[PDB]
Design a binder for this molecule. Structure first.
Ligand code: HEM
Ligand code: HEM
Lengths: 176, 176
Protein backbone atom coordinates (compact mmCIF):
# COMPACT_ATOMS: atom_id res chain seq x y z
CA UNK A 1 0.00 0.00 0.00
CA UNK A 2 0.95 3.64 -0.39
CA UNK A 3 -0.08 6.69 1.63
CA UNK A 4 -3.32 7.27 -0.31
CA UNK A 5 -4.50 3.72 0.57
CA UNK A 6 -3.40 4.33 4.16
CA UNK A 7 -5.54 7.50 4.36
CA UNK A 8 -8.58 5.49 3.26
CA UNK A 9 -7.90 2.73 5.86
CA UNK A 10 -7.40 5.38 8.55
CA UNK A 11 -10.82 6.78 7.64
CA UNK A 12 -12.35 3.35 8.08
CA UNK A 13 -10.87 2.95 11.63
CA UNK A 14 -11.89 6.54 12.46
CA UNK A 15 -8.22 7.44 13.07
CA UNK A 16 -7.69 11.23 12.93
CA UNK A 17 -5.18 13.94 13.95
CA UNK A 18 -6.69 13.69 17.43
CA UNK A 19 -5.52 10.05 17.57
CA UNK A 20 -1.99 10.94 16.48
CA UNK A 21 -1.69 13.21 19.57
CA UNK A 22 -3.09 10.53 21.89
CA UNK A 23 -1.13 7.62 20.49
CA UNK A 24 2.04 9.62 21.27
CA UNK A 25 0.70 10.05 24.88
CA UNK A 26 -0.14 6.35 25.11
CA UNK A 27 3.38 5.56 23.96
CA UNK A 28 4.83 7.76 26.69
CA UNK A 29 2.80 5.96 29.39
CA UNK A 30 3.48 2.47 27.94
CA UNK A 31 7.26 2.84 27.32
CA UNK A 32 7.48 3.61 31.04
CA UNK A 33 6.03 0.18 31.91
CA UNK A 34 7.26 -2.08 29.12
CA UNK A 35 8.77 -4.81 31.31
CA UNK A 36 5.51 -5.68 33.07
CA UNK A 37 3.45 -5.15 29.90
CA UNK A 38 5.63 -7.84 28.29
CA UNK A 39 5.22 -10.16 31.32
CA UNK A 40 1.42 -9.69 31.06
CA UNK A 41 1.37 -10.20 27.31
CA UNK A 42 3.53 -13.38 27.30
CA UNK A 43 1.67 -14.63 30.36
CA UNK A 44 -1.59 -14.67 28.34
CA UNK A 45 0.15 -16.33 25.35
CA UNK A 46 1.86 -18.75 27.73
CA UNK A 47 -1.34 -19.78 29.54
CA UNK A 48 -3.03 -21.29 26.43
CA UNK A 49 -1.26 -24.30 24.82
CA UNK A 50 -2.90 -23.65 21.36
CA UNK A 51 -1.45 -20.11 21.43
CA UNK A 52 1.95 -20.92 22.92
CA UNK A 53 2.10 -23.50 20.14
CA UNK A 54 3.20 -20.93 17.53
CA UNK A 55 6.43 -20.49 19.48
CA UNK A 56 7.21 -24.21 19.89
CA UNK A 57 9.95 -26.51 18.64
CA UNK A 58 8.99 -29.74 16.73
CA UNK A 59 9.01 -31.67 20.05
CA UNK A 60 6.20 -29.34 21.16
CA UNK A 61 8.13 -27.44 23.85
CA UNK A 62 8.54 -23.64 23.81
CA UNK A 63 11.65 -22.50 21.94
CA UNK A 64 13.04 -20.15 24.59
CA UNK A 65 15.47 -18.43 22.22
CA UNK A 66 12.59 -17.67 19.81
CA UNK A 67 10.44 -16.29 22.64
CA UNK A 68 13.36 -14.12 23.78
CA UNK A 69 14.07 -12.68 20.32
CA UNK A 70 10.38 -11.97 19.68
CA UNK A 71 9.90 -10.30 23.11
CA UNK A 72 12.56 -7.76 22.07
CA UNK A 73 10.89 -6.95 18.77
CA UNK A 74 7.48 -6.73 20.44
CA UNK A 75 8.88 -4.16 22.89
CA UNK A 76 10.23 -2.15 19.93
CA UNK A 77 6.81 -2.31 18.22
CA UNK A 78 5.18 -0.58 21.20
CA UNK A 79 7.35 2.53 20.49
CA UNK A 80 7.00 2.38 16.68
CA UNK A 81 3.13 2.45 16.92
CA UNK A 82 3.29 5.56 19.11
CA UNK A 83 4.84 7.99 16.65
CA UNK A 84 3.53 11.37 15.30
CA UNK A 85 2.94 10.43 11.63
CA UNK A 86 2.84 7.04 9.92
CA UNK A 87 5.03 7.31 6.81
CA UNK A 88 5.98 5.03 3.90
CA UNK A 89 8.85 3.33 5.77
CA UNK A 90 6.37 2.54 8.55
CA UNK A 91 3.97 1.06 5.97
CA UNK A 92 6.72 -1.06 4.41
CA UNK A 93 7.59 -2.54 7.78
CA UNK A 94 3.92 -3.36 8.54
CA UNK A 95 3.95 -5.58 5.48
CA UNK A 96 7.09 -7.17 6.85
CA UNK A 97 5.44 -7.84 10.29
CA UNK A 98 2.57 -9.62 8.50
CA UNK A 99 4.96 -11.68 6.36
CA UNK A 100 6.71 -12.75 9.59
CA UNK A 101 3.52 -14.16 11.22
CA UNK A 102 2.61 -15.77 7.86
CA UNK A 103 4.39 -18.85 6.41
CA UNK A 104 6.22 -16.54 3.95
CA UNK A 105 8.70 -15.36 6.61
CA UNK A 106 7.89 -17.01 9.96
CA UNK A 107 10.96 -18.46 11.70
CA UNK A 108 13.54 -16.94 9.33
CA UNK A 109 14.37 -13.80 11.37
CA UNK A 110 15.58 -15.87 14.31
CA UNK A 111 16.61 -18.87 12.27
CA UNK A 112 14.47 -21.24 14.34
CA UNK A 113 12.64 -24.48 13.65
CA UNK A 114 9.03 -23.88 14.69
CA UNK A 115 5.50 -24.23 13.30
CA UNK A 116 5.28 -22.91 9.71
CA UNK A 117 2.34 -20.40 9.90
CA UNK A 118 0.21 -18.53 12.43
CA UNK A 119 -3.45 -19.26 11.65
CA UNK A 120 -5.05 -16.03 10.48
CA UNK A 121 -8.09 -16.48 12.81
CA UNK A 122 -5.83 -15.71 15.80
CA UNK A 123 -4.13 -12.59 14.38
CA UNK A 124 -7.60 -10.99 14.07
CA UNK A 125 -8.67 -12.40 17.42
CA UNK A 126 -5.59 -10.87 19.08
CA UNK A 127 -6.85 -7.30 18.51
CA UNK A 128 -8.86 -7.77 21.68
CA UNK A 129 -6.20 -9.12 24.09
CA UNK A 130 -3.69 -6.51 22.73
CA UNK A 131 -6.10 -3.69 23.76
CA UNK A 132 -7.09 -5.51 27.00
CA UNK A 133 -3.44 -5.94 27.96
CA UNK A 134 -2.62 -2.19 27.66
CA UNK A 135 -5.73 -0.86 29.31
CA UNK A 136 -4.70 -1.09 33.02
CA UNK A 137 -1.24 0.25 32.18
CA UNK A 138 -2.65 3.34 30.44
CA UNK A 139 -4.65 3.94 33.60
CA UNK A 140 -1.58 3.99 35.84
CA UNK A 141 0.67 7.07 35.89
CA UNK A 142 -0.94 10.48 36.44
CA UNK A 143 -3.67 11.27 33.90
CA UNK A 144 -7.42 11.99 33.91
CA UNK A 145 -9.93 9.21 33.06
CA UNK A 146 -10.92 11.24 29.96
CA UNK A 147 -7.29 11.29 28.80
CA UNK A 148 -7.00 7.58 29.64
CA UNK A 149 -10.05 6.82 27.47
CA UNK A 150 -8.65 8.77 24.50
CA UNK A 151 -5.24 7.00 24.82
CA UNK A 152 -7.00 3.63 24.98
CA UNK A 153 -9.24 4.45 21.99
CA UNK A 154 -6.16 5.65 20.07
CA UNK A 155 -4.37 2.41 20.89
CA UNK A 156 -7.44 0.33 19.79
CA UNK A 157 -7.59 2.16 16.42
CA UNK A 158 -3.81 1.76 15.77
CA UNK A 159 -3.87 -1.93 16.55
CA UNK A 160 -6.88 -2.52 14.30
CA UNK A 161 -5.26 -0.46 11.52
CA UNK A 162 -2.06 -2.49 11.80
CA UNK A 163 -3.67 -5.99 11.80
CA UNK A 164 -5.67 -5.00 8.72
CA UNK A 165 -2.30 -4.08 7.08
CA UNK A 166 -0.71 -7.39 8.31
CA UNK A 167 -3.45 -9.41 6.70
CA UNK A 168 -2.27 -8.77 3.13
CA UNK A 169 -0.07 -11.88 2.69
CA UNK A 170 -2.85 -14.05 4.16
CA UNK A 171 -5.65 -12.91 1.79
CA UNK A 172 -6.42 -14.54 -1.57
CA UNK A 173 -4.98 -12.37 -4.25
CA UNK A 174 -7.36 -9.57 -5.32
CA UNK A 175 -9.64 -9.93 -2.24
CA UNK A 176 -7.74 -7.51 0.05
CA UNK B 1 -15.65 -24.84 12.13
CA UNK B 2 -16.94 -26.94 14.99
CA UNK B 3 -17.66 -26.02 18.59
CA UNK B 4 -14.31 -27.32 19.83
CA UNK B 5 -12.55 -24.82 17.48
CA UNK B 6 -14.95 -22.00 18.44
CA UNK B 7 -13.93 -22.66 22.00
CA UNK B 8 -10.24 -22.15 21.16
CA UNK B 9 -11.11 -18.94 19.24
CA UNK B 10 -13.16 -17.66 22.21
CA UNK B 11 -10.06 -18.18 24.33
CA UNK B 12 -8.03 -16.04 21.93
CA UNK B 13 -10.48 -13.07 22.37
CA UNK B 14 -10.75 -13.68 26.14
CA UNK B 15 -14.44 -14.44 25.83
CA UNK B 16 -15.68 -16.37 28.91
CA UNK B 17 -18.98 -17.23 30.72
CA UNK B 18 -18.77 -13.73 32.26
CA UNK B 19 -19.05 -12.27 28.73
CA UNK B 20 -22.11 -14.43 28.08
CA UNK B 21 -24.02 -12.62 30.85
CA UNK B 22 -23.00 -9.13 29.68
CA UNK B 23 -23.52 -9.73 25.95
CA UNK B 24 -27.13 -10.53 26.83
CA UNK B 25 -27.40 -7.30 28.81
CA UNK B 26 -25.74 -5.40 25.96
CA UNK B 27 -28.31 -6.86 23.55
CA UNK B 28 -31.22 -5.77 25.80
CA UNK B 29 -29.92 -2.18 25.83
CA UNK B 30 -29.15 -2.18 22.06
CA UNK B 31 -32.41 -3.62 20.70
CA UNK B 32 -34.54 -1.00 22.38
CA UNK B 33 -32.45 1.65 20.56
CA UNK B 34 -31.99 -0.20 17.26
CA UNK B 35 -33.45 2.39 14.87
CA UNK B 36 -31.08 5.05 16.25
CA UNK B 37 -28.12 2.67 15.96
CA UNK B 38 -28.92 1.85 12.33
CA UNK B 39 -29.18 5.55 11.36
CA UNK B 40 -25.82 6.16 13.17
CA UNK B 41 -24.19 3.13 11.50
CA UNK B 42 -25.39 3.96 7.99
CA UNK B 43 -24.49 7.65 8.41
CA UNK B 44 -20.88 6.58 8.98
CA UNK B 45 -20.87 4.21 5.93
CA UNK B 46 -22.87 6.71 3.86
CA UNK B 47 -20.58 9.60 4.74
CA UNK B 48 -17.48 7.99 3.14
CA UNK B 49 -17.62 7.49 -0.68
CA UNK B 50 -15.01 4.71 -0.58
CA UNK B 51 -17.22 2.75 1.88
CA UNK B 52 -20.60 3.63 0.34
CA UNK B 53 -18.94 2.23 -2.84
CA UNK B 54 -19.71 -1.38 -1.68
CA UNK B 55 -23.44 -0.74 -1.90
CA UNK B 56 -23.41 1.00 -5.35
CA UNK B 57 -24.72 -0.05 -8.79
CA UNK B 58 -22.14 -0.23 -11.61
CA UNK B 59 -23.05 3.36 -12.62
CA UNK B 60 -21.71 4.56 -9.26
CA UNK B 61 -25.00 5.43 -7.53
CA UNK B 62 -26.14 3.84 -4.24
CA UNK B 63 -28.55 0.93 -4.68
CA UNK B 64 -31.28 1.99 -2.26
CA UNK B 65 -33.05 -1.37 -2.27
CA UNK B 66 -29.77 -3.15 -1.51
CA UNK B 67 -29.10 -0.74 1.41
CA UNK B 68 -32.65 -1.27 2.75
CA UNK B 69 -32.36 -5.04 2.54
CA UNK B 70 -28.94 -5.21 4.25
CA UNK B 71 -30.10 -2.83 7.02
CA UNK B 72 -32.85 -5.31 8.02
CA UNK B 73 -30.35 -8.19 8.27
CA UNK B 74 -27.91 -5.96 10.17
CA UNK B 75 -30.74 -5.29 12.63
CA UNK B 76 -31.20 -9.10 13.22
CA UNK B 77 -27.46 -9.35 13.68
CA UNK B 78 -27.49 -7.00 16.68
CA UNK B 79 -29.91 -9.43 18.37
CA UNK B 80 -28.21 -12.64 17.15
CA UNK B 81 -24.88 -11.54 18.69
CA UNK B 82 -26.50 -11.24 22.15
CA UNK B 83 -27.48 -14.94 22.37
CA UNK B 84 -27.12 -16.96 25.63
CA UNK B 85 -24.86 -19.46 23.96
CA UNK B 86 -23.35 -19.55 20.46
CA UNK B 87 -24.35 -22.90 18.99
CA UNK B 88 -23.56 -24.84 15.77
CA UNK B 89 -26.33 -23.11 13.78
CA UNK B 90 -24.84 -19.79 14.91
CA UNK B 91 -21.39 -20.88 13.77
CA UNK B 92 -22.74 -21.98 10.39
CA UNK B 93 -24.41 -18.64 9.86
CA UNK B 94 -21.09 -16.78 10.63
CA UNK B 95 -19.51 -18.65 7.72
CA UNK B 96 -22.44 -17.43 5.62
CA UNK B 97 -22.05 -13.78 6.68
CA UNK B 98 -18.40 -13.96 5.66
CA UNK B 99 -19.32 -15.56 2.32
CA UNK B 100 -21.77 -12.73 1.68
CA UNK B 101 -19.17 -9.90 2.15
CA UNK B 102 -16.81 -11.94 -0.06
CA UNK B 103 -17.25 -12.28 -3.83
CA UNK B 104 -18.53 -15.88 -3.17
CA UNK B 105 -22.09 -14.81 -2.22
CA UNK B 106 -22.12 -10.95 -2.28
CA UNK B 107 -25.15 -9.52 -4.17
CA UNK B 108 -26.92 -12.90 -4.31
CA UNK B 109 -29.22 -12.72 -1.25
CA UNK B 110 -30.87 -9.54 -2.52
CA UNK B 111 -30.35 -10.42 -6.22
CA UNK B 112 -28.67 -7.05 -6.96
CA UNK B 113 -25.86 -5.90 -9.25
CA UNK B 114 -23.14 -4.19 -7.24
CA UNK B 115 -19.44 -4.33 -6.67
CA UNK B 116 -18.31 -7.98 -6.64
CA UNK B 117 -16.25 -8.07 -3.38
CA UNK B 118 -15.66 -6.10 -0.12
CA UNK B 119 -11.87 -5.73 0.28
CA UNK B 120 -10.74 -7.59 3.43
CA UNK B 121 -8.77 -4.60 4.79
CA UNK B 122 -12.11 -2.95 5.67
CA UNK B 123 -13.79 -5.88 7.42
CA UNK B 124 -10.95 -5.84 9.93
CA UNK B 125 -10.97 -2.05 10.04
CA UNK B 126 -14.73 -2.01 10.84
CA UNK B 127 -14.18 -3.75 14.22
CA UNK B 128 -13.42 -0.25 15.53
CA UNK B 129 -16.39 1.76 14.15
CA UNK B 130 -18.77 -1.10 15.03
CA UNK B 131 -17.71 -0.87 18.68
CA UNK B 132 -17.46 2.96 18.55
CA UNK B 133 -21.03 3.14 17.27
CA UNK B 134 -22.48 0.94 20.03
CA UNK B 135 -20.64 2.65 22.88
CA UNK B 136 -22.83 5.72 23.51
CA UNK B 137 -25.98 3.59 23.35
CA UNK B 138 -24.74 1.20 26.02
CA UNK B 139 -24.41 4.16 28.42
CA UNK B 140 -28.05 5.29 27.78
CA UNK B 141 -30.15 2.91 29.91
CA UNK B 142 -29.31 3.68 33.55
CA UNK B 143 -26.69 1.03 34.32
CA UNK B 144 -23.63 1.53 36.57
CA UNK B 145 -20.42 2.70 34.81
CA UNK B 146 -18.97 -0.68 35.75
CA UNK B 147 -21.74 -2.60 33.95
CA UNK B 148 -21.52 -0.23 30.98
CA UNK B 149 -17.81 -0.96 30.55
CA UNK B 150 -18.53 -4.73 30.90
CA UNK B 151 -21.21 -4.57 28.21
CA UNK B 152 -18.87 -2.59 25.96
CA UNK B 153 -15.97 -5.09 26.43
CA UNK B 154 -18.26 -8.07 25.70
CA UNK B 155 -19.53 -6.37 22.53
CA UNK B 156 -15.89 -5.75 21.47
CA UNK B 157 -14.99 -9.45 22.07
CA UNK B 158 -18.04 -10.81 20.17
CA UNK B 159 -17.41 -8.44 17.25
CA UNK B 160 -13.73 -9.43 17.07
CA UNK B 161 -14.70 -13.11 17.36
CA UNK B 162 -17.17 -12.88 14.40
CA UNK B 163 -14.92 -10.97 12.00
CA UNK B 164 -12.23 -13.64 12.64
CA UNK B 165 -14.78 -16.29 11.64
CA UNK B 166 -15.89 -14.26 8.58
CA UNK B 167 -12.28 -14.10 7.31
CA UNK B 168 -12.36 -17.80 6.22
CA UNK B 169 -13.29 -17.38 2.47
CA UNK B 170 -10.81 -14.47 2.15
CA UNK B 171 -7.78 -16.32 3.55
CA UNK B 172 -5.48 -18.46 1.39
CA UNK B 173 -6.55 -22.09 1.75
CA UNK B 174 -4.72 -23.64 4.69
CA UNK B 175 -3.58 -20.39 6.35
CA UNK B 176 -6.69 -19.72 8.43
C1 HEM C 1 -3.05 -8.12 17.33
C2 HEM C 1 -2.23 -9.09 16.90
C3 HEM C 1 -0.70 -9.21 17.08
C4 HEM C 1 0.20 -8.26 17.41
C5 HEM C 1 -0.10 -6.77 17.67
C6 HEM C 1 1.50 -8.90 17.43
C7 HEM C 1 2.73 -8.35 17.66
C8 HEM C 1 3.90 -8.90 17.13
C9 HEM C 1 5.12 -8.19 16.86
C10 HEM C 1 5.31 -6.66 17.11
C11 HEM C 1 6.02 -9.06 16.39
C12 HEM C 1 7.47 -8.75 15.94
C13 HEM C 1 7.45 -8.31 14.50
C14 HEM C 1 8.85 -7.92 14.07
O1 HEM C 1 9.56 -8.85 13.61
O2 HEM C 1 9.28 -6.74 14.22
C15 HEM C 1 5.41 -10.37 16.35
C16 HEM C 1 5.98 -11.55 15.92
C17 HEM C 1 5.48 -12.80 16.29
N1 HEM C 1 4.26 -13.04 16.88
FE1 HEM C 1 2.79 -11.65 16.96
N2 HEM C 1 1.33 -10.23 17.14
C18 HEM C 1 0.00 -10.48 16.93
C19 HEM C 1 -0.52 -11.72 16.60
C20 HEM C 1 0.07 -12.92 16.97
C21 HEM C 1 -0.54 -14.20 17.21
C22 HEM C 1 -2.03 -14.54 17.13
C23 HEM C 1 0.41 -15.06 17.56
C24 HEM C 1 0.20 -16.52 17.98
C25 HEM C 1 0.77 -16.83 19.17
C26 HEM C 1 1.67 -14.35 17.53
C27 HEM C 1 2.93 -14.83 17.78
C28 HEM C 1 4.05 -14.36 17.16
C29 HEM C 1 5.20 -15.12 16.70
C30 HEM C 1 5.46 -16.63 16.75
C31 HEM C 1 6.13 -14.08 16.12
C32 HEM C 1 7.50 -14.33 15.47
C33 HEM C 1 7.28 -14.52 13.97
C34 HEM C 1 8.62 -14.75 13.32
O3 HEM C 1 9.12 -15.91 13.32
O4 HEM C 1 9.19 -13.75 12.80
N3 HEM C 1 1.41 -13.06 17.16
N4 HEM C 1 4.13 -10.23 16.82
C1 HEM D 1 -16.99 -5.46 11.81
C2 HEM D 1 -17.26 -5.46 10.50
C3 HEM D 1 -18.67 -5.67 9.88
C4 HEM D 1 -19.81 -6.08 10.47
C5 HEM D 1 -20.01 -6.41 11.96
C6 HEM D 1 -20.84 -6.16 9.43
C7 HEM D 1 -22.17 -6.52 9.55
C8 HEM D 1 -22.94 -7.02 8.52
C9 HEM D 1 -24.15 -7.82 8.61
C10 HEM D 1 -24.79 -8.31 9.94
C11 HEM D 1 -24.57 -8.09 7.35
C12 HEM D 1 -25.77 -8.93 6.91
C13 HEM D 1 -25.39 -10.40 7.11
C14 HEM D 1 -26.57 -11.28 6.73
O1 HEM D 1 -26.79 -11.44 5.51
O2 HEM D 1 -27.33 -11.78 7.60
C15 HEM D 1 -23.66 -7.46 6.44
C16 HEM D 1 -23.74 -7.48 5.07
C17 HEM D 1 -23.17 -6.52 4.25
N1 HEM D 1 -22.23 -5.61 4.65
FE1 HEM D 1 -21.21 -5.74 6.45
N2 HEM D 1 -20.26 -5.79 8.23
C18 HEM D 1 -18.94 -5.49 8.46
C19 HEM D 1 -18.07 -5.10 7.46
C20 HEM D 1 -18.52 -4.46 6.32
C21 HEM D 1 -17.76 -3.55 5.50
C22 HEM D 1 -16.30 -3.12 5.77
C23 HEM D 1 -18.54 -3.13 4.51
C24 HEM D 1 -18.13 -2.09 3.44
C25 HEM D 1 -19.03 -1.10 3.21
C26 HEM D 1 -19.84 -3.81 4.65
C27 HEM D 1 -20.96 -3.72 3.83
C28 HEM D 1 -21.87 -4.74 3.64
C29 HEM D 1 -22.57 -5.12 2.44
C30 HEM D 1 -22.53 -4.48 1.04
C31 HEM D 1 -23.44 -6.30 2.85
C32 HEM D 1 -24.41 -7.11 1.95
C33 HEM D 1 -23.61 -8.30 1.46
C34 HEM D 1 -24.51 -9.12 0.56
O3 HEM D 1 -24.62 -8.78 -0.66
O4 HEM D 1 -25.13 -10.10 1.07
N3 HEM D 1 -19.76 -4.59 5.77
N4 HEM D 1 -22.67 -6.82 7.17
Amino acid sequence: MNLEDLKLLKEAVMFTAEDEEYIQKAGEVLEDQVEEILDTWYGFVGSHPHLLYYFTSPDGTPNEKYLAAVRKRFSRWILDTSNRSYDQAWLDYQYEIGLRHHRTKKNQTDNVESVPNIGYRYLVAFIYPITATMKPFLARKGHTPEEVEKMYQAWFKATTLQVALWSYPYVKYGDF
